[PDB]
Amino acid sequence: PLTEIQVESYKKALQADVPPEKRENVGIQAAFKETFPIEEGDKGKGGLVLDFLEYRIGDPPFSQDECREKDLTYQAPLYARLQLIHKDTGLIKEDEVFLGHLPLMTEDGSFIINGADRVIVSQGGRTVGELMADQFRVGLARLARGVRERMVMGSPDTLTPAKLVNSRPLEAALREFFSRSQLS
Amino acid sequence: EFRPGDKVVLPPYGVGVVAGIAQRSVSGVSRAYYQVDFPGSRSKAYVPVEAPHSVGLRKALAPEEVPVILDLLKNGRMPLPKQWAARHRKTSEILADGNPYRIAQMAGQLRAWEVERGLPDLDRQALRRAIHLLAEEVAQSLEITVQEAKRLFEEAWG
């Protein structure tokens, strides 16, 4: 079925059950690894590196029901394990940080956006995951070229992955992607 | 120099505990690190063994370094810059370096002002942040809660 590939498109796009090390360079993992690492500075000055280890997805605040009986979304928070390394001193600081909330499919094949049981569609051969997985790549693009802008206002000893990162650019990237979608 | 289970401090994330010695290859160069785990945090730090003081790592206060800290909060005085810009710079440094003794002595001075002459909010935030940090390292050292470590401080002032 059309809806079968899609609930699978999305399925492996996420690898949300795969042990990160057993996760493959596909979709989200691809997006992450394409984006990361981010180097900046001349190595000597504030020579920096922000690198990706893995992402985790923390299960949704509510099951289908509650996201439904409320003008909100069936979402899971997504966090990623990052390391900041000073090329100067060799110190690594590893935080898990929150990047964005992330919408989930039903076995039916739909999302509960702001309560609305909306629907995205397979275009130009691209499937659900793919079309989305590239939107992921977008936010991350925007987020890099952030992180690396912060990288050059100094504060080396003060800096942390946490401080290089916020949730806005990825929030936006999926905000827009899902404001362009059908209503079942 | 440092051993697993050692309670430690690493500016800026503060107190932690040496997990063990980690071997990471990072950017094509494999090296040994001390691994530091942070409080209910999921955040870690990896410090090269070759020189860890060099990079800010230190032991935390022993339970017997603690009463001297409490005396600093109670009776501590230090000279501070005339002008607010330079003063905030000094305090900003003291807070960053993470020297508990220097921080306690600063905090003692700042609190003193808060009483006699009055403390600017800007400087007040330096005091709070100082308290915050000291309460966590004292809580760690005596294995009491942070709320409990603060309450200690509160009494040291009256």
Author numbering:
A (entry chain A): 17 to 139, 332 to 392
B (entry chain B): 3 to 160
What is written in the article reporting this PDB entry?
Unique among known transcription activators, the CarD-RID interacts with the RNAP β subunit β1-lobe, which is near the upstream portion of the transcription bubble in RPo. The relative orientation of the CarD domains (CarD-RID, CarD-CTD) seen in the Thermus CarD and CarD/β1-lobe structures is only slightly altered in the Thermus CarD/RPo complex: the CarD-CTD is rotated ∼11° (with respect to the CarD-RID) to interact with the DNA. A crystal structure of Mtb CarD in complex with an Mtb RNAP β-subunit fragment that includes the β1-lobe shows a relative orientation of the CarD-RID/CarD-CTD domains very different from the one in our Tth CarD structures, despite high sequence and structural similarity within the domains.
CarD, first identified as a regulator of ribosomal RNA (rRNA) transcription in Mycobacterium tuberculosis (Mtb), is a transcriptional activator widely distributed among bacterial species, including Thermus species, but is absent in Eco. CarD is a global regulator that is an essential protein in Mtb, the causative agent of tuberculosis. Crystal structures of Tth and Mtb CarD reveal an N-terminal domain with a Tudor-like fold (CarD-RID, RNAP interacting domain) in common with the Eco transcription repair coupling factor (TRCF)-RID, and a helical C-terminal domain (CarD-CTD). The structural results, combined with supporting biochemical studies, establish that the CarD-RID makes a protein/protein interaction with the RNAP β1-lobe, thereby positioning the CarD-CTD and a conserved Trp residue to interact with the upstream edge of the transcription bubble, using a wedge mechanism to prevent collapse of the transcription bubble.
